[PDB]
């Protein structure tokens, strides 16, 4: 109810705690015309599912700074050449950056 | 300098871990509404009244 995104009816609450989801909340049944059928999510016998924490989805500042240096070097090399070749840049070239 | 963070992967993994559209909608009253499929829907965040 909490960590479901906003348009799916939830609140889209971000988390940074070890929140375990019991395997009784990953089961859903649908009634086809032939008969009711049931489903789980961890369909192979595995560990308990865990809410992803924001901690693993933000790049460290060190990597961001070194990548900023490298990427701006790439952009400078990709722009000074464009001066000689006489064309404006485009999304195609800079999508990788 | 643009937003310095991305949450598309985070929401992707949250949907994946929560059981997807059917794994979350089983908890909801969606099946009671009886829509043939969950596509082609919008949320009225504000009633006209």
């Amino acid at each position: 109810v909490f960590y479901t995104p906003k348009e799916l009816g939830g609140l889209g609450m971000l988390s940074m705690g070890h929140v375990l989801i019991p395997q009784s909340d990953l089961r859903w049944s649908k009634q086809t015309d032939v008969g009711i059928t049931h489903f789980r999510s961890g369909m192979s016998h595995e560990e308990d599912q865990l809410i992803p924490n924001l901690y693993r989805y933000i790049q460290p500042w060190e990597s961001e700074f070194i990548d900023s240096q490298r990427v701006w070097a790439e952009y400078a090399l990709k722009r000074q050449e464009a001066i000689a070749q006489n064309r404006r840049l485009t999304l195609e070239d800079l999508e990788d950056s | 300098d643009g937003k310095l963070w991305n949450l598309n992967n985070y929401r992707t993994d949250m949907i994946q871990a929560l059981g997807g559209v059917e794994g979350i909608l089983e908890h909801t009253l969606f099946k009671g509404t009886y829509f043939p499929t969950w596509e082609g829907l919008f949320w009225e965040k504000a009633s006209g009244f």
């Binding site: 375990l20 901690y55 933000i58 | 991305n6 992967n9």
Partner: peptide
């Protein structure tokens, strides 16, 4: 099982910030 949030202190042995976010 409970909905209470568990502190991830001591839960960071095998994880990194940039992992699973490329």
């Amino acid at each position: 099982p409970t909905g209470e949030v568990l502190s991830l202190v001591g839960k960071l042995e095998g994880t990194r910030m940039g992992d699973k976010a490329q």
